[PDB]
RNA sequence: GCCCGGAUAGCUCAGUCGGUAGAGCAGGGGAUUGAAAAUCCCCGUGUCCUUGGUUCGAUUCCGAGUCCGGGCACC
RNA sequence: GCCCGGAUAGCUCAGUCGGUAGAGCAGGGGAUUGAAAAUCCCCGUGUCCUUGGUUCGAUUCCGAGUCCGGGCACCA
RNA sequence: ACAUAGCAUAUCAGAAGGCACACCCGGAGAACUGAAACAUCUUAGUACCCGGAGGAAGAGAAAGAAAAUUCGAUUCCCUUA
RNA sequence: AAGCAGUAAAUGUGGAGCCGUAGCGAAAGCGAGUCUGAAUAGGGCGUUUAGUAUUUGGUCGUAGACCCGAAACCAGGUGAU
RNA sequence: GAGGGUAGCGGAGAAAUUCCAAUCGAACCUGGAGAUAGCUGGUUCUCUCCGAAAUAGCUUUAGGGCUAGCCUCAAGUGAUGAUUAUUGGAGGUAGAGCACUGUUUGGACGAGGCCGAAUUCAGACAAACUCCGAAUGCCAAUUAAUUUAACUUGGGAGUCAGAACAUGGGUGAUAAGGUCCGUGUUCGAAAGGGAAACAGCCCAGACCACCAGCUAAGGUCCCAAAAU
RNA sequence: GCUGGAAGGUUAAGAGGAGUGGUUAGCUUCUGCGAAGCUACGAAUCGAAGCCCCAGUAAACGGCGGCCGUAACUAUAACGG
RNA sequence: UGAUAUUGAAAUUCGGCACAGCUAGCUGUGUUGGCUUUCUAACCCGCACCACUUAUCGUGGUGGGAGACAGUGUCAAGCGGGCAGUUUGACUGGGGCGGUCGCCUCCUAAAAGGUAACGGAGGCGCUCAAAGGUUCCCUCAGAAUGGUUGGAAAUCAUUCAUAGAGUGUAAAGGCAUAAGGGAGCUUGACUGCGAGACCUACAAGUCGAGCAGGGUCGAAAGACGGACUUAGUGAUCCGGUGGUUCCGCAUGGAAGGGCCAUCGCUCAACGGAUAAAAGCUACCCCGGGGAUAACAGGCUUAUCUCCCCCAAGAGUUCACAUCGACGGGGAGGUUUGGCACCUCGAUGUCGGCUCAUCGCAUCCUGGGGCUGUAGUCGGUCCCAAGGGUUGGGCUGUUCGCCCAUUAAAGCGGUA
RNA sequence: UCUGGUGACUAUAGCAAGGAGGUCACACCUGUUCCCAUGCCGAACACAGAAGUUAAGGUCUUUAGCGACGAUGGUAGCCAACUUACGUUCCGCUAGAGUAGAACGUUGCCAGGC
């Protein structure tokens, strides 16, 4: 039930919000979403 | 005072800061020049004492929202982009 | 002068405003709300699209008509023509 | 007329936070030994208070309920 | 949301600074002696918390990790 | 014991007290009240108290203001607001 | 405005200032349009002109602010007949 | 008995909250000081025009306030406001009904080795039961007839203690001049006539004069106008 | 609560000064070191009483239980769990 | 109780740190704190003697005793009702007590919306990397009928099954085009927005066609800016972290601000007074109220006192001489209450003495019926207010029991 | 007209029964090499084909027995009026629900072939 932020790896910032429900996927969570000023789809990492 | 309920100026949030140097150009429009003649100059010693501008804080910008209608010669402080076309339309230099 | 029992519930919800918000015949505009419900009591027809389980709202201009097309179901259409 | 604690081997207590019942006193049958009392084995049935509902499932959560212990008790 | 201590025979503690696991309470079997309790021998399984990496080798050093004890706690 | 405190005579008028305490300058300094309660805050460095002067006291001759070209001791009035 | 002259004449001078002729944005800055925004897309606030000075009314704010009334608090003193 | 001491954040007390200049849970007298008061009482000359509310939301808030609601002048916009006929519509009450979850009393129906266990026929009940389902109200016709409003902006408020009747309801005991909502009327803020007198019921709205006539509600032998 | 105890945890002013930031002398000249100076911060370590810890004290403050069973007719229990 | 000043000398030690040398540990070796003592000039002696002086104060010398401690300042911790300013909510059929305080769903609610009460029923302060998006395909719980195991019912088939199942969560409204159940891929659980509506005091609150940039799924048409809806949350201020084309008080930097994204509150009394808050007054004080109680009027009759129907039964036999189970209908306004209408700018409150006055549902006396009335007594009922209705013990008593009588020791209203 | 494909019509249209045929057009089957695929099995999905069959599906003609629609009259409720404290009447408009009369075994657009 933990809030966690996703990190635009080339963008060099933090932009999104998710809800990683803790022990049902305790690993790192990496998706493909939009990251502006780069206008692409970067991997966003659960940090 | 809404009676214990907190007033309207506690819910709304505050934002901003003013400045320490917020140079306020006395904005003379371009329409006001359509009264005089000979096209000699316009001047921070003259454009005061023809009653047009008074107590210019710093700089007297020529914003353009009238019609020049004369081959006039200016000497202002600094300009606007469209009105600087109107002075060079009919013909006249300056010293920005 | 005896200590009376405690009540249990009270405790109502607030309200929501439901029902029709425009009526048969008049002239509506392309964002307005026709009808709204917590379910599906009125299906949409042509030129009327649903929302999130609520708020049948007109797509484009015109006047409204109510109509049934089954034995129980009812629908709403808007015809722009005049 | 009001809020809680609960009825847990025949006796006394235990967990009893929905899949998940324990001890000791008692009883019975052996052994002891002149005969009983001690003393030592081996055993069992509990009741999870009446009853319905959230029930994959209630000893376990609500309340239609009996009884009693803790405070009620106001000018 | 933060820094440490660690899960070391069934119970309690010990070293556990990479080659290098110990005690006592408990349990079982003998002996005692009318019968138990003491009392005396002889024994065993530890767990070095889940898991990966620096690994000639990790109970031992990092951290992906569960639980609890010591401080957090500021002028929202 | 050397001198000092101490002690004895002679001159001097310096002080003390009072003031309109109205105005001023330093020492010391509350609470009622407002915040719709109240403790930081504010009523306020206000009233009471005490000390020293004046016809006026205090300030004062830049270790200043300023940013352009600089002008210039302090006080007070109007605007900056 | 203050000041300076003047039957404590309400009139002469004084243009330091204030408001208005242009807004938008937190700000740099931009300008009849800016602002957010990748956008000339769409929006919010503007543009097309009337403000100004004095005064008679109505009402607000700060002062005790329609009058009359409390127990009660804090200073500074007078009282053991 | 005569002298003397202890003074308010204090003094004295064989302790009672007793005593301290006819007193005291903290004396008196000035000054801050016209303390504050969401609380009572009071507010002075006349006449014309129009004239409400006692509710909603939120509050250390329930007898106070702020905003919306209802009145008032001043400007505007100016057919948008009101009823009525016509058509088209939204929704599930009164009523009805047992197909639905539930409650029921009767008949035959099966379901062990002398009284009971699914279904079927004939009947009933319901705010949280509806296969049905009206009267009225309610929004809209670029609809037609009649009348007088409506809305936008800007100055000035007052109300946020309501009451009885007539009906739909909850609570109460189909009890109240009870309390709490809907919806109308009147009183509040309305005098007259009738109900013996009587704010709330029944007629009807007072600009003033007159020794004039018809009529409403109630009445007509007498008190007391009118038919023994 | 009060007295007595001395080791350990827990602390404050103060003493210490490992380091991190800002700045430019010089400098690759685009590109971070920064010596030194001056400044903003500050680490382990040391630093008592208290509180934890142990023992004593009731003419100190305070406290001084329930439930079942049994007797040569019944009754209740000297007694037992 | 510590630090540091006034505040000086000497020694013993026990240290950490900077170096050398050797076997992690010791010698010298220098910084460098402490720790015990030991002196003596500061300081203190309500410490004896002498002078000012004839004097218990005081000043000065002399001898003694303590001694770098104390006493004093400055800064820092813990103690601290001894003393001070203060807070201690509201709703409420009067108040404390009990329970409540915001959101979600029904009903009451009177066929639009709205609509209260301490009216009736239930929940929430989240959960899900797939239970979200897309493209395809499938239809249920049950009722029978038989079939290794037998739950009555854990799988298998066949047939009749309109939704009687299921939808992560409580209820209503929906769904069999599925919005239910599987299977393949993937992140639209995007960025910048938004014509116009609904609701509304405000702040908030939801619904949005379409527009650009980048996609996912699909053959394509199209769908997708979270889960069938409606709950699952908290203004401002202040602070933290990540960016920033922005300001940065001579100029250049920094420190600090502002924007944009985000975290910290059971502030749960949920529009949150503050960063931080509990009780008793019978010693009471002021301002107010019948808006709001106790006593007494008033309205009502649940209880209460009297009648009354119906008739099973008891009375050896007979329902009605007397008694009346189960059930119903009313009068009175004396008890216990309910409501808050008058009174808080005072309407004095229980018993008893004094003095009465009025009803009749009658206690005695007068008149009758009926008796399961031999007579004398007695039961029960009708008409009747003219008159009578006792002395003592007990407790404040009312009430009550008890003693001795009498023709009887009536029940009530009259604030 | 009739058979088929796609529309609209509230099941008046559908189920329930019963009789009739052919496959010129749907089916039934013949298989799985390929297109594709069954958490398995080509029954289904798809593909390749045409010897058989009208029994079945679908088509057509009867049956109102199952559901469904459904009038005229009534009665309850009810806006307005009147009278009255009665679980009320009385007068004037709208007017169901159930139940009976019954209608009903579909209708109609457009395509390609008879
Ligand atoms: Mg005396
Ligand atoms: Mg006392
Ligand atoms: Mg005395
Ligand atoms: Mg006063
Ligand atoms: Mg004052
Ligand atoms: Mg009028
Ligand atoms: Mg009904
Ligand atoms: Mg009803
Ligand atoms: Mg009534
Ligand atoms: Mg009303
Ligand atoms: Mg009126
Ligand atoms: Mg009269
Ligand atoms: Mg008369
Ligand atoms: Mg350093
Ligand atoms: Mg001396
Ligand atoms: Mg106190
Ligand atoms: Mg209250
Ligand atoms: Mg109460
Ligand atoms: Mg409604
Ligand atoms: Mg600078
Ligand atoms: Mg500077
Ligand atoms: Mg007393
Ligand atoms: Mg009373
Ligand atoms: Mg009665
Ligand atoms: Mg009474
Ligand atoms: Mg009332
Ligand atoms: Mg009064
Ligand atoms: Mg009076
Ligand atoms: Mg009195
Ligand atoms: Mg009588
Ligand atoms: Mg009498
Ligand atoms: Mg006696
Ligand atoms: Mg096959």
Swiss-Prot record, chain A:
Keywords: Ribonucleoprotein, Ribosomal protein. PROSITE patterns: RIBOSOMAL_L33. It comes from the Bacteria. One of its GO terms (biological process) is translation. GO terms for molecular function: structural constituent of ribosome. Pfam families: Ribosomal_L33. The keyword Transcription regulation does not apply. GO terms for cellular component: cytoplasm; ribonucleoprotein complex; ribosome. Signal peptide: none annotated. Belongs to the bacterial ribosomal protein bL33 family. PANTHER family: 50S RIBOSOMAL PROTEIN L33, CHLOROPLASTIC, LARGE RIBOSOMAL SUBUNIT PROTEIN BL33C. HAMAP family: Ribosomal_bL33 (MF_00294). This is Large ribosomal subunit protein bL33A.
Curated annotation (Swiss-Prot), chain B:
One of its GO terms (biological process) is translation. The keyword Glycoprotein does not apply. Keywords: Ribonucleoprotein, Ribosomal protein, RNA-binding, rRNA-binding. GO terms for cellular component: cytosolic large ribosomal subunit. GO terms for molecular function: rRNA binding; structural constituent of ribosome. Binds to the 23S rRNA. Belongs to the universal ribosomal protein uL15 family. Part of the 50S ribosomal subunit. This is Large ribosomal subunit protein uL15. It comes from Staphylococcus aureus (strain NCTC 8325 / PS 47). The chain holds residues 50 to 145 of 146 of the full protein.
UniProtKB/Swiss-Prot annotation, chain C:
It comes from the Bacteria. It holds the Pfam family Ribosomal_L27. Keywords: Ribonucleoprotein, Ribosomal protein. GO terms for molecular function: structural constituent of ribosome. Disruption phenotype: Essential, it cannot be disrupted. Part of the 50S ribosomal subunit. A mutant Prp protease unable to cleave bL27 copurifies with its substrate. It comes from Staphylococcus aureus (strain NCTC 8325 / PS 47). NCBIfam families: L27. InterPro entries: Ribosomal_bL27 (IPR001684), Ribosomal_bL27_CS (IPR018261). One of its GO terms (cellular component) is cytosolic large ribosomal subunit. This is Large ribosomal subunit protein bL27. One of its GO terms (biological process) is translation. Belongs to the bacterial ribosomal protein bL27 family. HAMAP family: Ribosomal_bL27. The N-terminus is cleaved by ribosomal processing protease Prp. Uncleaved protein can be incorporated into pre-50S ribosome subunits. Cleavage of the N-terminus of bL27 is essential for growth; it cannot be replaced by a 'pre-cleaved' or non-cleavable form.
């Amino acid at each position: 039930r933990v809030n966690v932020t996703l990190a635009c790896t080339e963008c060099g910032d933090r932009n999104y919000i998710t809800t990683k429900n803790k022990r049902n996927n305790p690993e790192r969570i990496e998706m493909k979403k939009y990251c502006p000023r780069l206008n692409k789809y970067t991997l966003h990492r659960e940090t | 005072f809404e009676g214990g309920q907190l007033p309207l100026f506690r819910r709304l949030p505050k934002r901003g800061f003013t400045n320490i140097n917020r140079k306020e150009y006395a904005i003379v429009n371009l329409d006001q020049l359509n009264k005089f003649e000979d096209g000699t100059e316009v001047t921070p010693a003259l454009l005061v004492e023809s009653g047009v501008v008074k107590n210019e804080k710093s700089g007297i910008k020529i914003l353009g929202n009238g019609s020049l209608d004369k081959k006039l010669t200016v000497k202002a402080h600094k300009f606007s982009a469209s009105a600087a076309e109107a002075i060079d339309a009919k013909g006249g230099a300056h010293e920005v | 002068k005896k200590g009376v029992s405690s009540t249990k519930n009270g405790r109502d919800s607030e309200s929501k405003r439901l029902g029709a918000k425009r009526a048969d015949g008049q002239f509506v505009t392309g964002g307005s709300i026709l009808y709204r419900q917590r379910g599906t009591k009125i299906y949409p027809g042509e030129n009327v699209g649903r929302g999130g389980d609520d708020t049948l709202f007109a797509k484009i201009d015109g006047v409204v008509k109510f109509e049934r097309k089954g034995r129980d179901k009812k629908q709403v259409s808007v015809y722009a023509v005049a």
